[PDB]
């Protein structure tokens, strides 16, 4: 298997290039020497391709024969707290996000948003959290790429525990071995997160769990996308379960993982 926005084919077999960003490069470097080393794609350093910097990553699809892929965005919160400060002091009115909001729900915007034809990023991202499962379950399905070539990103209103279960039910297509392997992996990831020095000291926002399986029953799960993962002020740590309140920088990451494990455990007994 192979993946090939921000991605480019690598020179070397089994690798992929992702546009380098400073938060993400800092994170992947730290993760290679963390408990979470095996839970993330291998990071091999940075390369230049036509004057641009790329992260050299493990292509997670490379082991698989016609991979099925599900991207699950983790956390009750999907934006940095500084976005709220910027939206109050010096707001950037996003005409595009008003349109994207209008497209999903023409009646979601306020009187004033309608008049602006524009919303703030945090307002848009909080709305996306509330009509998806992000706010109540601490994760949401972002998309699926199936082995039949078909892909879907039509999950913005996938919200209830039972709606999420039905997406995973269709994704695994009755393969008990794949589901057992996903649950074993998620249990071991949760154990690793609970002991990780990196995880206790970082606010993990905008990251995904990438589920990958094939018709040969190979199955894996990795954490990806550390573009918005930021170190806490030294000596401060998060519990990753307690509710977010502006200033505490809580992400609900483990509330999301606990709920996700519960849903797959439910599916396995159906």
Ligand X SMILES: Nc1ncnc2c1ncn2[C@@H]1O[C@H](COP(=O)(O)OP(=O)(O)OP(=O)(O)O)[C@@H](O)[C@H]1O
**Closest CB 47 distance from ligand X, rounded Å:** 15
Size of interface with ligand 75I, in residues (CB under 6 A): 7
Q: Which is nearer to ligand X, 57 or 118 (CB)?
A: 57
Give how far the C-alpha of residue 5 lies from the chain's centroid of Cα atoms, to the nearest Å. 16
For residue 57, state whether it binds ligand X (rule: CB under 6 A): yes
Q: Could you tell which of ligand 75I, ligand X, Mn ion, none binds residue 3, using a CB distance below 5 to 8 A set by kind?
A: ligand X
Residue bearing tokens 């995880």: 199
Across the chain, the runs of DSSP E, i.e. the strands, are 7-9, 15-19, 43-49, 52-58, 68-74, 139-145, 151-152, 202-203, 208-213, 219-224, 230-231
Q: Which is nearer to ligand X, 224 or 261 (CB)?
A: 224
Site string for ligand X, 62-91 (x = CB under 6 A): -------x-x--------------------
Considering only residues 4 through 63, tell me which ones interact with ligand 75I, judged by CB under 6 A: none
CB 248 within 8 A of CB 261: no
CB 32 within 8 A of CB 194: no
Options 100, 146, 181, 201; binder of ligand 75I; rule CB under 6 A:
100
Options 225, 228, 256, 263; binder of Mn ion; rule CB under 5 A:
225
3-state DSSP percent of the chain in helix, strand and coil, to 5: 40, 20, 40
For residue 78, state whether it binds ligand 75I (rule: CB under 6 A): yes
Considering only residues 215 through 254, tell me which ones interact with ligand 75I, judged by CB under 6 A: 227-228
CB 180 within 8 A of CB 217: no
**Closest CB 57 distance from ligand 75I, rounded Å:** 17
CA distance 178 to 231: 34
**Closest CB 24 distance from ligand 75I, rounded Å:** 10
CB under 8 Å to 39, separation ≥6 — which residues?
189, 192, 193, 222, 223
From the list 52-60, 88-96, 120-128, 177-185, the region that binds ligand X by CB under 6 A is 52-60
Q: Which H or E run contains 102?
A: helix 95-104
- Show binding-site residues for ATP: 6, 18, 58-60, 71, 145, 225
Interacting residues toward Mn ion by CB under 5 A: 225
């Amino acid at each position: 298997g192979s993946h090939m926005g921000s991605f480019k084919a690598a020179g070397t077999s089994g690798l992929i290039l992702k546009r380098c960003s400073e938060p993400e490069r800092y994170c992947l470097a730290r993760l290679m020497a963390d408990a979470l080393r095996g839970c993330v794609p291998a990071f091999h350093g940075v390369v230049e391709r036509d004057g641009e910097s790329y992260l050299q990553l493990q292509d997670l699809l490379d082991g698989f024969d016609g991979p099925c892929v599900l991207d699950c965005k983790m956390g009750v919160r999907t934006y940095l707290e500084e976005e709220l400060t910027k939206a109050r002091e010096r707001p950037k009115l996003r005409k595009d996000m008003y349109k994207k909001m209008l497209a999903v729900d023409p009646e979601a915007p306020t009187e004033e948003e309608h008049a602006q034809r524009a919303v703030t990023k945090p307002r848009y991202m909080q709305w996306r959290e509330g009509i998806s499962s992000s706010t109540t379950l601490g994760f949401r399905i972002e998309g699926i790429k199936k082995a039949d070539g078909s892909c879907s990103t039509d999950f913005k209103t996938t919200r209830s525990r039972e709606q999420v279960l039905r997406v995973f039910e269709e994704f695994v297509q009755g393969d008990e071995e794949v589901l057992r392997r996903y649950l074993n992996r998620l249990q071991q990831i949760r154990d690793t997160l609970e002991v990780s020095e990196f995880f206790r000291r970082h606010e993990v926002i905008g990251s995904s769990l990438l589920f990958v399986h094939d018709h040969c029953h190979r199955a894996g799960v990795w954490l990806i996308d550390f573009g918005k993962t930021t170190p806490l002020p030294d000596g401060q740590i998060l519990d990753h379960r307690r509710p977010w309140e502006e200033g505490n920088r809580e992400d609900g990451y483990l509330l999301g993982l606990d709920n996700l494990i519960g849903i797959l455990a439910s599916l396995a007994e159906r």
